[PDB]
Amino acid sequence: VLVQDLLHPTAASEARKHKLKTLVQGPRSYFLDVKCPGCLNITTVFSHAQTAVTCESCSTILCTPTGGKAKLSEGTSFRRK
Amino acid sequence: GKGKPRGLNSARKLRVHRRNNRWAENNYKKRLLGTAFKSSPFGGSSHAKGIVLEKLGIESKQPNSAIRKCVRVQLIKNGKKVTAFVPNDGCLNFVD
Amino acid sequence: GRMHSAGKGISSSAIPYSRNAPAWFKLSSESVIEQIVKYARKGLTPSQIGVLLRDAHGVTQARVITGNKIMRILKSNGLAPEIPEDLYYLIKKAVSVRKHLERNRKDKDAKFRLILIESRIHRLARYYRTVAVLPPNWKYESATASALVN
Amino acid sequence: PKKRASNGRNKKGRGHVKPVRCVNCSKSIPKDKAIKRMAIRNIVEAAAVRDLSEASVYPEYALPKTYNKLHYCVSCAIHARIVRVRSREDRKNRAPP
Amino acid sequence: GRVRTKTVKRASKALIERYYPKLTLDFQTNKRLCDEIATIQSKRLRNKIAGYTTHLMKRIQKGPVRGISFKLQEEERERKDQYVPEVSALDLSRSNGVLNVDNQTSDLVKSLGLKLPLSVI
Amino acid sequence: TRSSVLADALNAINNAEKTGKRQVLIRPSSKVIIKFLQVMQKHGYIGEFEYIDDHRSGKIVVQLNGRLNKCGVISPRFNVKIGDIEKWTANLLPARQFGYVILTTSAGIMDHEEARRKHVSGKILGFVY
Amino acid sequence: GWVPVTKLGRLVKAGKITTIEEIFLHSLPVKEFQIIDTLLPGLQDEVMNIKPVQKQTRAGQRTRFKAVVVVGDSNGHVGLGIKTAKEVAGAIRAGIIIAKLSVIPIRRGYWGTNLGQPHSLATKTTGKCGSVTVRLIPAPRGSGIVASPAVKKLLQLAGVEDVYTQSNGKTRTLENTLKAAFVAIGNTYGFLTPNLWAEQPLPVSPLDIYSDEASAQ
Amino acid sequence: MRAKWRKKRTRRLKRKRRKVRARSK
Amino acid sequence: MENDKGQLVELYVPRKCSATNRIIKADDHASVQINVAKVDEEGRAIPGEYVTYALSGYVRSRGESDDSLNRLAQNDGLLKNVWSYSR
Amino acid sequence: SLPATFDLTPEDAQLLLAANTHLGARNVQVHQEPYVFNARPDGVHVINVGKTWEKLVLAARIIAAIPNPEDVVAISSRTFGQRAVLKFAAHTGATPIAGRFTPGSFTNYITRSFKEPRLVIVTDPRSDAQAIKEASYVNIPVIALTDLDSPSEFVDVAIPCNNRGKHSIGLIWYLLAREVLRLRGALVDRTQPWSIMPDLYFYRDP
RNA sequence: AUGUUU
RNA sequence: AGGGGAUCGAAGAUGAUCAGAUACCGUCGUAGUCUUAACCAUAAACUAUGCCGACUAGGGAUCGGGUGGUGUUUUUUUAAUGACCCACUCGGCACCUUACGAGAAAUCAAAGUCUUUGGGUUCUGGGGGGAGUAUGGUCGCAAGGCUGAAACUUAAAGGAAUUG
Ligand SMILES: [K+]
Ligand SMILES: [K+]
Ligand SMILES: [Mg+2]
Ligand SMILES: [Mg+2]
Ligand SMILES: [Mg+2]
Ligand SMILES: [Mg+2]
Ligand SMILES: [Mg+2]
Ligand SMILES: [Mg+2]
Ligand SMILES: [Mg+2]
Ligand SMILES: [Mg+2]
Ligand SMILES: [Mg+2]
Ligand SMILES: [Mg+2]
Ligand SMILES: [Zn+2]
Fold first, then answer.
1. Could you say which residues from 74 to 93 on chain C have a Cβ atom under 8 Å away from some Cβ of chain F?
2. Number of neighbours of residue C138 by Cβ within 10 angstroms
């Protein structure tokens, strides 16, 4: 090499690098609108949620905490915003 | 770093470390302890008068030969007994 | 890193470059503040308040959304604890380690860990006394450690 | 100098390894340093296999094997030629022969 | 043993390197011209050199051997060419007039060349 | 821990220049680093450099042109008198005709030539040649 | 005569290349000493030292003789040759050959102002061989060569008239000291100064300009 | 002599010196 | 390097590597000068007319001479899609 | 800068694809090769044949820039490329080195050896490392037919191609010779397919 | 298996 | 100081060798080896490589976590985990090649970024002995640990490597 664009690296390389080792560091996590069994609100759930998030007006589990990304109880839909 | 403080306010530690480590030098340690005054029968002097006590033949170390004809002398200054070589061919007849 | 360990782990949160609330977030700043106060009155520390806010709600950062940090909101609303959260949990950990040491007395590893935890506690308390968070005569005492957190 | 790039043993990130006794002389040698050879032999080595197959009351007996892990100290391994002195470059070769 | 030394092998090699349009593969006529094209100082050494030259000539007609360059190996190297003629350079054949490549090779071709018979499957 | 961001930046630049790279990314790219880079650029030892404004302390990408033999810091930032500027230049620079000892003075960060023609002094920051 | 090989030598004999500066500019490898002889006629040599090196073999003392030779005119050019041979005279002659083949240019400069005919080095330079480090520092006019006798002889055969020297390591190893000094001398043209920043048009090698000098008719 | 055995001889000498000094007062 | 009254007193103004801009020394025998023949009117490779590149022995030893020459050639023409600034 | 006639035509493009030049090294590759088109499964990488063609054209122009044709030396110790370099040095005026390099051929001016090339082209840098080393000892530019796992040290012009396939090696050498002749003037028009087929360069085991 | 000094 | 004391086993006793052999080898065998409560604080306590931080080659393995896949395999009933493959990533034990570089070399991705000498900081050494001795202090029940000279003596001692 010895010559490259350190200011405009390829998007593939930036997605390959660690979240802290990108050109400008940023989170690789996100939020999802989970389709609740009820209504009146669409619950927003963190992807790497440490909590077993329940519905706002119910008691059904939307996610189960894991090491990284949380589970989704195996019945749900989720919009990625 | 190099194993020593570089900070602008580390002059005390630098000079104390130098003071401590100067003791490992022979000349500095001898000078600061005054070894020549107590030890070294010539009490910090270049020359010393004495009275010859005995002619001795001291055999030279290996691989040499030819015993060196020194003299045991009692120094007038402090009474200590030292051995002095008599350097020339002969010259032991010149001392009694 | 790892002030009392050999680890060099870099795992940490990488907050986004954006200092403004996400577009998809529609909840009011006063609403999320009210939920923060509700959780605090329920007894949650700022760490668990932020965890619940980001897990079960859509609030990404309380600073970027409400213009104020969670602990600052609690102090302004008069819910600040007697001692800071991190110091309180360090003291609780020390109390647990000491309570295990009393009943074991042979866990030299536990004694070493108690020494490490108490050193961290003393350094944190020194910092807090310096910034006047704790009283200038505040002192952590092992014989009275438990009574300060329970 | 340092003869071997790591050591005359295999211990990095370990610190201490429990010892084993040499099967030949009973010298205590750390387990990571001891020369370990698996001996998997037929019970009847080579010659009496025919005689034991003839004398066997079972057709196709499929005679068993003796398994034995031998741990040697360096001196005994060299004396018994389980390992040999190698050239300086040949020492940097960990593949078995 | 009947191994031949340097003074025989090198002398035979040079004799071939300078006298190829010369002595055939018969030792009797190989030793005769050795006396006129070489100043050998013993008939036994002459016979040894002639015998090795005969052997080398008998084994040169069945494939060039190392270290023998008498300015005719290049002429024969140029004369022997086109091992498999008149059929194809492996172009537009051995298939349905196409190239049997993969999908990734198909994108490689479509990068610049839109005219190429491809059978990506 | 990190004790001199200018030292880290100049060491990264030195390693890139001696490995032949024509660009170098330095972090956290403080204002002292920016001023030092600007002096080097004004004297032609480095090319264009980009400040990448993350909402952390920031980053910089410098373009190197192969004219930099060595850039380095002098740590600690020794106080330098006007008469001591000559001694520092004699010790650090390869020759009296080129090379610059950079000082942080109350008149700003500047090379020793500018400092002595402004008749100002301060603390030594580093050198470039 | 010469009867050259190494077509650079053929060009030098034919007179197409007239100065060693072209060879230095194009980094042409020199393999015959006659090229250096014809391009630098006034190249004086000096034997720095001859020492016996002994190989122990079956009553030992193979006792070959190693000669260090410094060649050069006192204008911009020196070469260093270290060579061992069975006899002192042959070692000296082969060392002279090797030094001529190793002749390199030196960049002289000014300590202070630009008053012509440079007297010192352009920059501080360092050479290292073995444990010996030789540092050459530009010096004002009239300073002379402040160096040990061997390094001073090498520098005065290089044409430097004012230079300071600093040495570290076992300088009594004369071969290593001379090699380090030679490396320091050679680095003078490898140190890029601002006055060499200007781009040059990368001229065409003489091996291309005069290309019909490699053939056998 | 082996450095270990020199150390052991020196330790025995030190013990003997300690005993002979303790016996005096 | 000129003296007073501006005459060149220095011999052997040296060549510089086209990739790293460092001086090609007289003993830099790993260095290389590459001539690329110019093309006129669909080929015919005009002799004596080249685009000239100097590559240092350091670059060639590090094995970056290929990439550096690709970049320099593409910058001067001579090549269309080989070297990319982003990678 | 090269006119439109110099770009990769469909004829030699399909020639390269038939000879399998694009089948580069396995998922292990030297990290100095941007000649890699996206990797296909089963490990084999796809070499950008367009970049291969442009590198070949640049190498051909560099060879044509040499004043004396005999000053060009083509080297191949591997059997797959010995006939290719022999054909290259038969068509062009280059000097061939097929088989052993006799280390000391660029230094060590003893006879039976000691050519002084102005340019050296090697079939495989790994198997012809000695020639590359000697060229780096005596300032000789190097063109090499390099796979994706070939060493790039002292390789001035890399031509990315499959150096495991005899067809690919012979075709690359054939294209080098053809482009050199076109640039010199032996082939008056660079549109004809150079009727003599690129099988004169392929190795023959039987 | 052992074989002491120079 | 208690308990326990199978095995091995400083000491000791013995058999044999030897010129002598209360050494190696053989047979016993006390303390010890094991444990509780207290000391001791020393090891070639070693990677003979202080700790923190940044940068400077390539590569394949492997441990732990995570991310993704038209992934293979296991059944619960969509899927999911479990195991495995591929790729990436963070952290770790290491390894292979090459070293721009470093070194006296052996060798070293650090032992590099050092006469082009300065990121921060702690400790240690100043030729070999005398000597880790004497003395004083201090700790220990003791053995000893920590601190630690001097007189005097000596031209080498030592490190890496080469050939015999
Ligand atoms: K004598
Ligand atoms: K017992
Ligand atoms: Mg860190
Ligand atoms: Mg700490
Ligand atoms: Mg040894
Ligand atoms: Mg240990
Ligand atoms: Mg003797
Ligand atoms: Mg015995
Ligand atoms: Mg100790
Ligand atoms: Mg130690
Ligand atoms: Mg000493
Ligand atoms: Mg030794
Ligand atoms: Zn054993």
1. none
2. 14
C65: closest CA of chain A, how far (Å): 16
**What are φ and ψ of residue J174, in 5° steps?**
-60, -45
Q: Is G1-105 a CATH 3.30.160.20 domain?
A: yes
Rounded-to-integer distance, Cα G165 and Cα G146, Å: 6
Which of G111, G195, G197 minimises the CB distance to F96? G111
Task: Just give the CATH number of F69-129.
Answer: 3.30.1490.10
Q: Which own/partner pairs from D28-35 qualify as long-range (CB within 8 Å, at least 24 positions apart)?
A: D29/D71, D29/D72, D29/D73, D29/D74, D31/D71, D33/D8, D33/D9, D33/D74, D34/D71, D34/D72, D34/D73, D35/D71, D35/D72, D35/D73, D35/D74, D35/D77, D35/D82, D35/D83
Q: Residue I54 is encoded by which pair of tokens?
A: 């100097």
* C-alpha to C-alpha distance for J196 and J177, rounded to whole angstroms: 12
User: Which of I59, I68, I86 lies at the smallest CB-CB distance from A10?
Assistant: I86
Domain boundaries, chain D: 1-97
Which residue in A26, A28, A50 is closest to C55 by CB distance? A50
- Spatial neighbors of J198 by CB under 8 A, at least 6 apart, are E89, J15, J19, J170, J171, J174, J175
E45 contacts: CB under 8 Å, gap ≥ 6: E7, E8
Q: How many domains does chain B have?
A: 1
Q: CA-CA distance, F9 to H19, in Å (whole number)?
A: 67
J97 touches chain E (CB under 8 A): no
Q: Please work out, in degrees rounded to the nearest 5, the angle formed at the alpha carbon of residue E20 by the alpha carbons of E17 and E22.
A: 135
Taking CB atoms and an 8 Å limit, are A5 and I64 in contact across chains?
Answer: no
Residue span of the structural domain in which E57 resides: 6-61
Which residue, J161, J168, J190, is CA-closest to J178?
A: J190
The CATH number of G106-199 is 3.30.230.10
For chain F, say whether G123 makes contact (Cβ under 8 Å): yes
The shortest C-alpha distance from J88 to chain E (Å) reads 12
Q: How far is the CA of D42 from the C1' of L83 (A)?
A: 35
Query: Which residue of chain A is at minimal alpha-carbon distance from F16?
Result: A2
- CA–C1' span, D31 to L48, in Å? 22
Does A1 contact I at CB distance below 8 Å?
A: yes
Is the Cα torsion angle I39, I40, I41, I44 positive or negative in sign?
A: negative
The nearest CA of chain I is from the CA of F86 a distance in Å of 24
Minimum CA–CA partner of A47 in chain C: C55
Taking the domain J10-200, which CATH number applies?
3.40.50.10490
CA distance B82 to B63: 25
Q: Which residues of I fall within a CB distance of 8 Å from J151?
A: 63
Give the method of determination: cryo-EM
Question: Is the dihedral angle over the CA atoms I61, I62, I65, I68 positive or is it negative?
Answer: negative
Contact of I35 with G204, CB cutoff 8 Å: yes
Would you state the structure tokens that stand for residue J48, as one six-digit string? 């950008």
Q: Answer for the pair G50, G24: CB distance below 8 angstroms, yes or no.
A: no
Query: Distance between CA C52 and CA I42 in Å, rounded?
Result: 72
The architecture CATH gives domain A1-81: Single Sheet (2.20)
Q: Between 1.10.260.40, 3.30.1740.20, 3.40.1400.10, 3.40.190.10, what CATH number should domain D1-97 receive?
A: 3.30.1740.20
Q: Domain F1-68: give its CATH code.
A: 3.30.1370.30
Are C56 and A43 in contact (CB < 8 Å)? yes
**Residues with Cβ < 8 Å from G110, sequence gap 6 or more?**
F97, G118, G119, G120, G122, G138, I3
Resolution, given in Å to one decimal, reads 2.0
Q: Which helix (H) or strand (E) holds F41?
A: helix F31-42
Query: Distance from residue A46 (CA) to nucleotide L75 (C1'), in Å?
Result: 31
What structural domains and CATH numbers belong to chain C? Answer: 26-80 (no CATH), 81-150 (1.10.287.10)
